[model samples]
Each structure stands twice: as C-alpha cells, then as structure tokens.
Target: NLDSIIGRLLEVQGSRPGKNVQLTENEIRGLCLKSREIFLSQPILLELEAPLKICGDIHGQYYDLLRLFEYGGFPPESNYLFLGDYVDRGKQSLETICLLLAYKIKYPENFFLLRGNHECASINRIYGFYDECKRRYNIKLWKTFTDCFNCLPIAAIVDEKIFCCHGGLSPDLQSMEQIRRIMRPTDVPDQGLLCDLLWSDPDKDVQGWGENDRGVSFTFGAEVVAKFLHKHDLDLICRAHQVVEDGYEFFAKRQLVTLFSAPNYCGEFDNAGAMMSVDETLMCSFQILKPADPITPPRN
Candidate 1:
C-alpha cells in the first residue's frame, strides 16, 4: 500500500500535469493514520545510530528533498534522522510530508523524523502550509496532517554524543530523561520545555538566556551550549532553524551546528543546503547541495 503511494508519489518528479500525480484524499488519510500510529509506537525521544544521514528543514522544498536523496542515497540504504520543518514556505508541503511519511511507514527503524516549530499548526497555518492543503484537498486534510505531525518525536540522540533537535537547549533541560519523558500527540506551547525545545535558538554573543526576535522562546548563548553539553555529557548540539550562509555552520567553537536544508531559502539568501553524515564511529561531515533554480530540474 505504501509502495503504491510512494510509487505514485515518485511520478511527480517531472513537471507534466499527468506526471505530477498526487495521492487521493482517502489514500492520504490512510497514510496519515498509519504513520501516526507508527509515530505513537515510538518514544517522544529517539536514540539512533550513525552511518546515518541527518537532514534539516525541508520547508516543503520537494525538489530539494529529492536532490538530498540523490546525494545521500535513498532510504533503507542510508539510515536517516530528519530535523523537521517538512511543511510550510515551499509550494509542495503536501507531497513533501507525505513522501517522508510514506518512507517512515515503509522503513520505520531505518528512518526517523523530528518535530520543528513550523510543523506546529498555529505557526504553520500562518506561514503557507495551511492554504496549500486547503487548496489541494480541504481543511479536513490539513487537520489529518496536523494530527500526524503532532505525534512526531521532538529530539534524537545519535550514537550518544550528538544532541539533536529542531531548535536548541532549554534551561528546563536538566537531564536527558526529561526529553524521553515528553509525551506525544500534543501541540507546541508558548513557553515551557517543549516550547523552548522546538523554538529556541543559540546566540553567539548573549552569555545566558536572552529574549528572542521570534518573541516567544529564549535565545541561549555559548555558555549555555557548553554547560548543557558538559552537564549532559554530550559532545555537540546539532540543530536546524537558522539559514546559514553555507548549508551547514558551526557555533560555540564547534560545540553546536546549524543546518538549514532549504537551499536558496525563501527566494533569498541563495544559500546551499546541507546534510550531515555521521559515520559508524559517529565522526561527522556535511554533504552540500548548491543553490539552484527550483523551477529547473537537476541532471544526473
């Protein structure tokens, strides 16, 4: 069933209207429930392995999502841990999230997806994803997608050294057990541990918790990063949310990293997208995708 959806979903790589096939509402509904159940079966916090490809905000750039797979190799072959933002901004959140869900259903253990600030309904509905869903199917479909998104795990620890999340550290984060104890099927709050985890950012200058331009979550600084890692016994904090000049960037003297996978973000920045490859030993590197015209297709 998933293969049928994935196979049909694969046809949309080309631009022809006939080739730009989308799954039926019923088919999508089925996948959402199935994926939601799969999400429920797993814990809110994921502990994963390397030889894994960690990706950042897809932001519904479906072409770039495909480009990422081309470079990283498709699922099941390379274990993947995605850092969310799969919806909003781009024109193709429908296919983008669904394709990732399809893959999740197909290979549960080999692939994982984490929650992001944009994946939340309140912010996502405001940006661009809600309208796309309303146009394609109806508000009902968007609701279904939201339910699935709600169940997505919030953070992941890969090989026990790298601490990964959509955003960054929380002052409430006193222990790793707190992350595991976070329950699912809940919406993001305005301010709290969950709120900060999905919404916080790392500041280079600010020494401690500071006000964010986002105006909701706090901005943690270099000392915050170092202290959090040392306290938790983590080597680095890997996160996504900021659009770096390169596809990936290091901060806090390489104590943290920001990876934004939406190349040429928002028709601005003209930034490249990057996926961090963590090897079997947990040594890491980035694979970059250059900024390209989204309307034009890539050549093999």
Candidate 2:
C-alpha cells in the first residue's frame, strides 16, 4: 500500500496523456498517497434495496459517467444498480472505480454493483486495468482492489420483477431460484454451467450453444427471453455485453435491453451510450447521455 504523501505527489506530476512519462519526486509521493487511499478502501459488492434503476456496462468512461449522473440523477435519492465492467479500456479507469467506491461508501443503501467479465483478476491481467493500476500505484494496491472486485455479485433482481446481469442469460438459469441457489465463486469456473452465465449471448438463430465471430458464446434467442420471463415470472431480463453503436438497444421488443454508458468506446468506436431508469411499475426507460461537449473530452 502507498502512503498518503506519495499518492498526492503522483497526481501533481501531470505525467500522463504524454509519451515516455516519468514520475518526478513530488509525483512519486503523491502517487503513494492515492495508492494508500485506494488500498485502504476495499472494493466490494453492495446490496441495494428495491425500486431502483438498473444500468449496465460502464467500461470505465469517467466523463460519460458524470454525464449519466447529470441526466439520470444521483443515487439514494435515485436508486441505481450497475451491471458491472466498472474498469478497463477507458482513459480514467482507476479514477472511475475510485469515484464509484466513494459513492458506495457515501450511499451504500442506494447503490447495487455486480461483477462484469472484466472484474475477474485473470481477465484484468489481460486487459489494461490491472497493468494500469500497477503502473500508476504498486502491485499490492492493485491486488487489494482486485480481491475486493472478486466479491461483486453476479446478478440483481429488481422487486423480483426483473433479472439484471452483465452478460446474457444462462441456459442453466431457467429460473431465478436457480440463480439464488448457485454459489458465486471468486474466479470464473473453467467449464460447465457457471461459465455460461457471464459469457452467453442471445442470438436470433442459434438454437443451441455456438460461438460468434468474436469467440463469445451464443445461446438462447428471443424465444428464450420470452420463455425465461414466463418461467421465472419476471417482467424482463436486462443485460449488457454487446457493443451497440447506440447507447442502448432493445431486444425481443424490450424483453431485453443492453445499455452501454461509454460513448466513443475505446477512443475509436462510434457509439452513443445510455443508462436505463426503472420506475415503480417495473417499466424501464432509457436516457441517452452524450458528452456535454464532444469537443472537450472528460478530464482526468
């Protein structure tokens, strides 16, 4: 864990957004301070009460998240459930998670967070966040937060009327009872039922397990969505996975909607992002949030 003085010094260096960045003496101390705070606050899954709005796939777009809050409203005052992918592939991944943790600490009752495919430590190692965290802070701090991330919930149910998850519905999860019965492991299982929950995708034609061009598992079509709803007595199954050029895409006529809050994904993808608001009646509405000023990117 970094000391407080080290952390703030790093923040003061302004070494980022430039090539061959080297931390100065002051920067090193500032980084230690930030790392200490990050290490001290463990990232963990938060359970929120009912009647909250459900959102999906932040993927660490910090500025867009602020825009989302501006348009969608704040938590506790406005209940919210984030489906996951809180870090990685965005400019402000570390800061994004820190801000999220701050919100969680401030309004634990109002926030519901779940694990995404990227939350797994192994996945992060391949992705940029794990390395980024290590580069910015120290390995110990990265591991600390990674352990906290492992504890995130796999799914969330809204008033027992909706099923929310980061990825697609699992073929194994025929009912919500099954989901409740399954134990969430710290790391994803190698094979069988557990793997499908976080990796599955709903296709229009595939009748059974198949692989998409991206090598993502595809199973369950629109018919499956309807069947799952009826079988589980759920109003809808909301998920986030596929990147939509638009912020949210409705599948099976709103039986499923994928919300992506990161616009201009990966700094190149042409996508407008959005979040969904669920009202008391179980009706979910999408509020599209774009950069307040596209010309001005979000600050670090």
Candidate 3:
C-alpha cells in the first residue's frame, strides 16, 4: 500500500510543474509515522558506507530531484545519501518531502537523508514547507512532519573518511562519541553540538571559529576544519547550505566541500546542481546536473 501510495510520485514529470500530489491525510500520516519509526530504530548519527551518491539541498524542486535520479540511477540501483534541505524555496515541498520519505521507507538501507537547517521547524515555517503543508493538507500534517524531521539523523560518517552533514563542523565535536550521544525526537538546540552541526558554515578567509552570517552557529575556518579532521581522523567535510556556482566546490582543497543542488535556485541564482560519488574505496568524483534555462556550459 505504501508502494502504491507513492508509485504515482515516482513518475518523472517534465520540467514544468505538474498537478498537485495529494494523499489522504491518513495516508500521509501513516507514511511519515512509518518513516519516523525507521529513523528512531537507526542511530541518531548514521555510520554509512561508500559506493554511495551524495546529493545536496533539493529545496523542493521535485522534477529536478527526479532528474538527479535519472543521472545517478534510482535507489537500490545505487545507494544515496541526501544532504537535506529537501523542502522550502521551491514550488513542490509537499511532493519533494513525500517522495524522499517514501524512498526512505522503501529502501531504508540504500537511501539515506540528513537534517539540514531548513528541516528545523523554526526555519521551514519561514521558508516555505510549513505554509505549503498548511495550504495543501492542513496544519495537522505539518505537525506530523515536525515529528518525523526531528527524528532524522543529524549527520553521517561515510567509510570513516567523509563527514557528511547539511551544515559544517561544530566546535563541540570532540569525537564521534559526542555525535553518537545526541538523542532523537528532540529539537535542534539553540547552541552546542546539535546546533552547530546543523547550522555552522565553513569560512574560507577566517581561521578558527567566527560569527556566522546566518546569525546562528559559528563559521569555522580552514584551520578549524583541518584540526577537526585530524582530531577525528576524518578526511573531508561534505556539506550543503550555501549556494555555489559549481554545485560542488572544494574548500581548503578537499578539507571541506559545499554541495548545492538546486539549480537556478529560487528562480534567481544561475547555479548548477551536483552530486558526489564515493566508490568502494572512497575515491570521490562529482556528477554535475547543469541548469536548464542555460545549463552548465560544459567544461572541457
């Protein structure tokens, strides 16, 4: 029944938005609750593996999310680790979140999702997801999503080498023990490890911790990044929060990576989207999805 509930959404609609995707309130409720159960069963912080495709913020671009699948291979065919921001800013937050949630249930092991800053109630309420759920399915469903999002794992360690999160490194991260100790079904705190993990950014020009332009969490510099990696024995910090022209940009020459996947973001920035591929041995490469209006001018 869950499969049938989402079979229609799996259809790849074209670039133009399609008719709204509506599920019965009961149906949506069940889907989210089921996904929440899966999240609760897993570690609050996931220990994931390679041969995985890592996607950045989708921002509710449903069709483009499908395009990502077309390029990278659908779930089970390939493993995916989505770096959140799945809702807000685009037109189809409902469809986008629903699809990802359903995929989590269907391919729980192969497909993964992390909590981005936008996943928080405080952020989505202002951005778009909160209102979208209200207009389309009533606020009750939005509340259900809040329950589910709260349980989503905060970050993932891939192959013990790549550190993947929607945001950047946190100062409180003394070790993965601190990360594992974070409990679930709780709001992202105002400050501390949970807050910084989901809200921090990497400041290229500055070293050590600096004030985040976002006004919450700190912007850690390259030295902080390198120190954190060496301290934790991590190789790269893979994150997605800010818009990048390349969709994927390396920081401190691979010490950190900013991956932004919503092309022509908010119908404004003419940026491309990208996904990273980490093989069995953790050799990393990028698969770029050029924007359509004037897609990525192929680099040669």
Candidate 4:
C-alpha cells in the first residue's frame, strides 16, 4: 500500500548531500502511478483554506526542503501549498520530488503541489531533471514523472482571498469561471491562457501588458495586477517564477508577492529563501531562511 511505500521513502528523507536514496525501477514507477492518480483527482484550480503554509520553488534542494519542514512543521500537522518547480536545477531532484509525492500520497488533503514552468517536458529536457533521470534511472522513468506533471493542478485559491499560481496573471484570464474551465492531463501550450499562466512574469516598468524576453509569456505591470484582483475579488495574487535576492519580493504595491524558496539557487546566487504563512484570520507572515552556507570565501 501507499502507506508502507511512503513510510519507506521518509526513512531516507534526511540522507542528503552525502548519501542519497536509490530506489528500484518498480518503486519509482509505483510512486509515479500513485501520484498521477492523486493529481488527477484534484481540480485544475485547487480551492484551499487559510491557516496553511505556502512554499515556493524548491528546485530539488533536498536538504533545504528538509530544513523547511523543520522550520515550518511537517505534513499531517501543518498544511502546505507548494508553488511548483519541485524538480531540476539541483543535485537531488529525485529525492526532492520523491519525498514530496510520498507526502502527498500519505496526506493528500494536507499537502498541495502546483505546476510550474519547469514541469513541462520540453523545459525538463533542457534543464537538469531529464539528465538526472537518465543518469540515475532511465528515460522511461523521466517520462513517467513528466506524465504525472501533466496531471498536476496549475493554480490555487486560498480562502477566496489570495490567488496563487506558479507564474503571474495571463492576458487570457477573464474570470474565475474561465480558470475553472481549463482541463488537465494536457501539456502547456506555447501561447494562450495555460501557457501564460505558467510562464508570465510581473513587470513594474510596464503599464497594462508587454512582451516578455522569455519569448513565450508576456510581462504584466501593476495596473494589470490591480485590475485582475479587482475583477476576481481577491486581495492579492501570490506567484513564484523569478528568483528574488531576498527570497520574496512584493510588486504592484504589495498586490502581488513573488516568492522563491530555493536558497543559493543553482549553487550560485546568495539569495535567501522564504515561505508565506496565513493564519486563521487571514493575516500573512513570511519566514525567510538564509542559504545553507550563508558565507563564501573570495574567489582567487
């Protein structure tokens, strides 16, 4: 059963950096199958409650993820809503994603995961997840995970006050009903609402909308965010796409908050990572953590 499987995976949740869990092919395949089933049962836009911990991009920093659980309480105790980018660009993608999926399987309602831009097959192939799977497991296993990604929910609404997605607002977004109309188990298109929802970024320089340099998504400004919140009757839009030096950044006069939970991203940046907590009263709070090694020696 998934209970035993989850228990086995959690046994090695802390053996990172030096030691890594080596799962058999059947074990990983079972995990992907179960995870896909769980994701398929969720809606395209998850309707969640408050008093939950909101986390941003993890990007396979297994140790930091464990640290996050230590800081913010683990699942079945404290509810979590992860804003995607769970894999790739780090040394422990397999372990990071495995633990997360296991937790989701064990505690489906307590742990929620959204889809990010990296969850795409095209992006994962170019990034580290595809390569990591090939090196550690095989291409078939990578495809399994990709299929599961296609089933993940793309956005979430918390207590009907906060709107959360991996990327920012889309020009195609007209109403909450439109967001609910979207279907899942499909790949993100290069253009249209689904694509923009996962690829777009918030720009402070522009007004209504502008083309993004990413070549796939548009750049929306403060005016656009304000209009979106007013149209949706939401107080704020929370997203995770770009990396911020402080781990989180407020845009559009705090109407939109961009969070990044991967500290020292890609083993290069010296940025901090953060998570958002919303109490029962809907009051927001942030908990930031410096890099695992906050200091570095000068390069020769």
Candidate 5:
C-alpha cells in the first residue's frame, strides 16, 4: 500500500511553478507520520557505505532536486546521502520535502538525510518553510513537519573515511562518540555543540575558533579542520551550509568540502549544483548541473 502511494507521488515529483500537485491534508499528514517513524529508527550519527552519491543544500528547489535524480540516477538504482537543507527559501518546500520522505520510506538503506539548520523551527520561522506551510496548508501541518525534523539524524560517517553533516566542526566536539551520544527530538540550542554543528561556517582567515558574524555560531579555521580530521582518523569533512558558485568548494587544502546542490539559489545566484560520487576504492568524483531558467514563482 505504501508503495502504491509512493508510486503516485513520484508522478508529480517534478511539478513546479506552472505545474503543481494538488496534495491533500490527509496525504501530508500520512507522509509526516511515516517519515517520523523512519527517522526515529535511525541513529543520531548515521554510518553509511561508499559507492554512494552525496548532495547538499537543496533549499526546496524541487525542479533542481529532480535534475539531481536524473543526473545521479534514481533511488535503489543509486545510493544517496543528502547533506540537508532540504527545505526553505524556495517555492516548493512542501513538495520537495514530501518527495524525499516518500523516497526514504521506500528505500531507507539507499537514501539518507541529515538535519540542516533550516530543518529547525527557529530558522524556518524566519526563512520560508513556516510561512509556506501556513499559506499552502495549515499551522498543524507545519508542526507535523517540525516533529519529523526533530527526529532527523544530525551527522553521518561514510565508509569510515569522510565525515558528513549539514554544518561544520564544533569546538565542543572532541570525538565521534560525543556526536553519537547526542539525543534527538530536542530543539537545537542557540549555543553549544549541537548549535555549532548546525550553524558554524569556515573561515580561512581565522587561526582557530572565532566569533561568526551570523551571531549564533562560530567560524572555524583550517587548523581546526586539521585537528578534527586527525583526531577522528577521517580523511575529510563534507558539509553543506554556504552557497558555492561552482556548486562545490574545497577548503583547508581540500581537507574539507563545502557543497551546494541548489543551482541559481533562490532564483538569483548563478551557482552550479554538484553531487559527489564515491567508489569502493574511496575515490570521489563530482557531477555538476547548471542552473535552468527560473520557474514561475510560487503563490504565497
């Protein structure tokens, strides 16, 4: 029965702007219920294998997300690890999130999602998802989505070589065990370890931890990245937060990678979107997709 439902949802997965799906209240409620269950069963620190595809910062760009599937191949056919920011700022947040939930339910092992800053209530309230949910559905629906977000895993380790998260390194973080010990279904705090992992940015100028202008999280330097990788025995840190014009950027001398998957972000930036593919040998390759013409704006 779930498969039947997901099959139908897939038909409209590409809908955006001029073409939109008529999703019902019951449909969304069901999706939220199922997704919450799936997320709860996952660990706070997900462990994944190589030979997978990694994406970042979709920001509710449903059409661009569709392009990613086309470029990388569909689920079950290709393993995927989305680095989060699946919602907010774009017109199709609801559709974008729903499709991902559907896929997660269908292929839990092949598709993985990490929580992003936008997945939290505090950020989405000021950004776009909260408003979009209220305008398109209702306040109750928005609450449902946040409930699922609370259960989302925070970080992942791929092939025990690359560490992945929505944001970057935390000064409070000491070991991978510390990350695994963090409990979920809790609101991300304004400060501390969880906050830093979800909000911090990288700064090549700073030597270590410094105050970030964002006013909430710290900006870490290359030295911090080197120490973290050395401590964890990880080869690199793969994260998503800022928009990179090339869709992907290597910082700390390619020790850390910042990836963005939303091309023409918010219909403004001329950035390209990219995804990384890792082979069994742990070698990584990137697939980049260019921006398409803006879709008609969503009705708010």
Candidate 6:
C-alpha cells in the first residue's frame, strides 16, 4: 500500500538549494551558539493536549514516513509528535530532514520533533546519516543541518500527564527539571544526566539497569518511573528506542511504552512496526504496520 502511495514523493528535485535557504558557515556557527544560549536560558516545554499521535523511529525512511502522513493527518491541523531517529541507516536522509523541516516551518503550532542520539555528531559519524548527508547535500548543508539537529528539543510533555522522549529515562535525572538544565548545541556528553535520557534502554526481564551501556550512561529502575510520574504529576512515559519485536513493548505495568517504527531493522530482524495515537483523555490507541513485502534474505 505504501509502495504505490509514496512513489510520487521520491522524485528528485532539479533546482539547486533555494536562495532563501542559503546558510554560510559563519551564520550556521552563530545560529548554533545562539541556540545554545536559548536552550540554557529557558526550559523546553511540550504542547499539552489529548488526541495526539505518537510516531516512532523513522530512520530516514522518507517514503514510509510519507505513508504515515497519508494514514495520520499532517500537522498543525493534526496533533502529532515524533520520537527521534529521523536520519541514518537509509538512503533518503536529506529528503527526510527537509520534509520534517517543512512541517516544522509550516506548523510551528502543532507538530513536535525531538533530538535523538543519532542526531549527535558523535553517533552520526559512526552511523550513515552524517556521510549520507555529505554525499547527497554537500558538506556545508550537512553542517547547517547538524546545527539544526543539535538545537532540536530533547524532550516534551503531553497534557501534563505524559512524558515523551526519544530514549528511556536515566538514573541521574532526579526530576524533569533536571533534564531541562542540559545545554544544547554541543555533543551529548559521554556520561551525564543528559546522555542517560538519550541512550538508556529498558529490559523487560530486568526491572532496571545494572550498569551503563556505550551510549547509555545509566540504567533506569521501575522506582525511577514511579518517582518521575509522582514528581511530574504524570500518568505515563512514552519513548522510542530499541528494536521491538512487535513494534512496541510495555513496561512497569504499562506506565512506559516504547515504540519502534522501522521494520526488518538492519535487514535482519523480522518484525512489524507501530506508532501510537493518544486521545484527550490520556488514552492511547496504536496502529501496527507491516512492510509491503518481506525483504529477500542476503546470500551468506
């Protein structure tokens, strides 16, 4: 279904970078520095509402993301938020970023996007998005995009009843306000409160984490979720990370829900994907989506 639906969006544009979109190196640097100042000066806040849809990791699947729009309504008029991982591991990095930016520009009121670990230079250098942008959009554009990525909001709250982020909670974040204090326009630090929120994973078998992983600085416990809920006066924590066998997993008695949108992740896992839609009453409904066709296995 998505195959036919998205064919129209895949055509390459012939125009060079639009004149209005030009950004010199000095301008980009100034924007980053100013973004850092703004991030530090104020706390990031999310729009509060019911009837909001929560989308999962896109991973630069530009056509599939467009398909998602076909199913879900486009923003401003429609309420929606996306957990990060919008770039990397796919051939359409530039297309994906530009599309999301168009949405951000058009509907600054309703649509929300957050910064995922992959948006960081450290991670993208290891992954594919950094180089992919270079090859497709030129290095200067890449730098400008990274500056924009660095300035993306790290987290958001919905209706004062839910917490949404790209990754799981970290032990260092004693309160939501603590996460707000993290500076922007800089690489995610290796070991800190901010890093934990951006990279931690929840284990279904284990109640919490025992040690830190490479990107995750700390493991979170069930009690941490409880404390966060009580302190923030929220009902749920929603995030997107990890490869979910069923596109989603519930933890801590459904207090935390993790959604993953990419299917057949890394060309290995046989999994369907999902995105979440929430109503005004803090109730969530999910739509599970499968790939159009099973990918052919690679020859060993």
Number of clashing residue pairs in every model? 0, 19, 0, 0, 0, 3
Give the per-residue lDDT of model 6 (tens digit) for 1-300.
222212323342323322122333453344344444443433454555777888888887666676677667655556778888988886566566555655554455566677788888778767787787566446765666677777777888888888888887776777666766666656777877667767887665555565655534656777767777888788999998777888888888888999988777656777777889887777788887777569999996
List model 3 lDDT by residue over 186-260, tens digit each: 898889889988889887788788998877889888889888888878899899988999899988877899998
Candidate 4 lDDT over 186-292, as tens digits, reads: 99898999999999999989988999999988999999988888877899899998899998899988899999999999978999999999999999999998965
lDDT of each: 0.88, 0.66, 0.88, 0.89, 0.88, 0.69
lDDT tens per residue, model 1, 122-179: 9889989899888878899989988988999999988789989999888888877887
lDDT of 2 by residue, 49-96 (tens): 456767677776666666667667755578777878888887566666
Instruction: Please provide TM-scores, in order, for all candidate models, with all chains considered together.
Output: 0.94, 0.78, 0.95, 0.94, 0.94, 0.81
Q: Which stretches of candidate 1 lie over 4 Å from their true place?
A: 14-19, 293-300
How many angstroms is residue 279 displaced in model 4 relative to the true structure, after the best TM-score fit?
0.9
Query: By summed lDDT, which 10 consecutive residues of candidate 3 come out lowest?
Result: 11-20
Candidate 4 clashing pairs, residues 3+ apart or interchain:
none
Residue-level error in angstroms, candidate 2, position 213: 3.7
lDDT of 6 at 299: 100
Once model 2 is optimally superposed onto the true structure by TM-score, how far is the C-alpha of residue 63 displaced, in angstroms? 1.5
Give the worst 10-residue stretch by lDDT in candidate 2. Answer: 39-48
lDDT score of residue 252 within candidate 1 = 92
Which 10-residue window in model 4 sums to the lowest lDDT? Answer: 9-18
Scored by lDDT, model 2 comes in at 0.66
Q: How would you encode candidate 5's per-residue C-alpha lDDT over 30-119 as one tens digit per residue?
A: 888987888888888999998899999999888788889988998888999999899999888887898898898889888999999999
Task: Return whichever of 3 and 4 wins on lDDT.
Answer: 4
Error of 5 at 236 (Å): 0.8
Which stretches of model 5 miss by more than 4 angstroms? 12-18, 292-300
- The residue ranges of model 2 lying beyond 4 angstroms of the native Cα positions read 1-50, 291-300
